[PDB]
Every structure is written in structure tokens, then in C-alpha cells.
């Protein structure tokens, strides 16, 4: 048997006004089915009919969904990204100075917003952000949001700065 991977909608993607501080558009759990039952392997974002997640979560596997089978459209192993059904749509960038919110969706746990200041690390062309928190395996792909609710990164990836 090949791995039976599917997505389930977990909630809306919204900035939460008083967060904790350290089918349709939304945030989805990426699940695997075994005879013994289901495991969450990651998270992703449906935007403009395109499902976005990390390449390591699916390794280009087709996904079952409420809308039928989703086939991979584009991916990059090095950036660790993959899109289903169409081109990559998550084009927002972090300004490199505003606090962000991680919309963490860990396995077997409630979706929640956590406000956090990314770390900044120097690169040769500039700087990149990091949200490295203590979340369980399977949280990778959780969206990182700016104050307008735009997805500026996925949990486990560097947060790209444009400034």
C-alpha cells in the first residue's frame, strides 16, 4: 500500500487581538491513514483554491480532501515548499520589525494564536526571521501571520524579510 494522505479543515486564519504572548480558504491538518487509525504529519494553508504546505510533510504525495483528490502542482525540496492545484499564492513578506502570530495547529490539540517576535539572523544578501518554539512533531506548516492576517511564513521555515 502507498501512504493514504488527506487534509481536514481546522479553522479560519485570523489575527487574534489579545493572543497569548511568548474546500474553503483556511488552515488544514495534513493526516495519514493507517489500519490502526490516523496521524497528523503537518499543517497547511488553503488560499485561492491552492493548498500550501511543506515539501517534507507530503513528499509530493497526492492528497484526499472534501473537494476530491488534489495533485501537486509545484514544489521545491530546498525551500521545503509544495503547492497543490495551482501555483504558489502565499506572497506576503514580513517587514522584519512587527510582531507576528503563529497559528499553531499541533496534532490532537486546539488551533491557537501565539504572538511572538521572530529572531533575526544575518545572511549574505540580508537577514531572515526564525520562529523556533517548542511545538510537537506534526505542527510544521502552521501559518505565521502579520497584523492583517496575511501568511508571511510556515512554521519550520525561515521567515523571509523584505526591507
Binding-site ranges for Cl ion (CB under 5 A)? 130-131, 158
| Binds a copy of itself by CB under 8 A, chosen from 56, 64, 89, 112 | 56
Regarding 90 and contact with ligand YO1 (CB under 6 A), the answer is yes
| Binds ligand YO1 by CB under 6 A, chosen from 49, 88, 107, 112 | 88
| Binds ligand YO1 by CB under 6 A, chosen from 138, 154, 155, 156 | 154
Cα–Cα distance between 133 and 136 in angstroms, integer?
A: 9
- Torsion region of 57: left, alpha or beta (phi above 0 gives left; psi -120 to 50 gives alpha): alpha
Which listed option, ligand YO1, Cl ion, a copy of itself, none, makes contact with residue 122 (CB within 5 to 8 Å by class)?
A: a copy of itself
Q: Does 127 participate in catalysis according to the annotation?
A: no
Regarding 59 and contact with a copy of itself (CB under 8 A), the answer is yes
Identify which of residues 110 and 122 has a Cβ nearer to a copy of itself in the complex. Answer: 122
Q: Does 140 participate in catalysis according to the annotation?
A: yes
* Minimum distance, C-beta of residue 152 to a copy of itself, in the bound complex (Å): 14
Q: Which stretch binds ligand YO1 (CB under 6 A): 15-23, 58-66, 88-96, 99-107?
A: 88-96
Three-state secondary structure of the chain: CCCEEEEEEEECCCCCCCCEECCCCEEEEEEEEECCEEEEEEEEEEECCEEEECHHHHCCCCEECCCCCECEEEEECCCCEEEECCCCCCCCCECCCCCEEEEECCCCCCCEEEEECCEEEECCCCEEEECCCCCCCCCCCCEEECCCCCEEEECCCCEEECC
Q: Which amino acids are annotated catalytic?
A: 56, 80, 140
* Residues near ligand YO1, by CB under 6 A: 74, 79, 81, 83, 87-88, 90, 92, 125, 151-154, 157, 160
Amino acid at each position: 500500500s502507498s501512504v493514504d494522505m488527506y487534509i481536514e479543515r481546522a479553522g479560519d486564519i485570523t489575527w487574534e487581538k489579545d493572543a497569548e504572548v511568548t474546500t474553503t480558504d483556511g488552515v488544514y491538518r495534513v493526516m495519514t491513514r493507517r489500519t490502526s487509525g490516523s496521524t497528523q504529519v503537518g499543517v497547511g494553508v488553503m488560499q485561492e483554491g491552492v493548498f500550501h504546505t511543506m515539501w517534507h510533510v507530503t513528499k509530493g504525495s497526492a492528497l484526499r480532501s472534501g473537494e476530491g483528490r488534489l495533485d501537486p502542482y509545484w514544489g521545491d525540496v530546498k525551500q521545503d515548499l509544495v503547492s497543490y492545484s495551482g501555483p504558489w499564492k502565499l506572497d506576503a513578506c514580513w517587514d522584519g520589525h512587527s510582531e507576528v502570530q503563529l497559528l499553531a495547529v499541533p496534532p490532537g490539540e486546539r488551533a491557537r494564536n501565539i504572538q511572538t517576535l521572530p529572531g533575526i539572523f544575518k545572511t549574505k544578501d540580508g537577514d531572515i526571521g526564525a520562529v523556533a518554539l517548542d511545538y510537537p512533531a506534526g505542527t510544521s506548516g502552521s501559518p505565521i501571520l502579520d497584523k492583517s492576517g496575511r501568511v508571511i511564513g510556515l512554521y519550520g521555515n525561515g521567515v523571509v524579510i523584505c526591507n
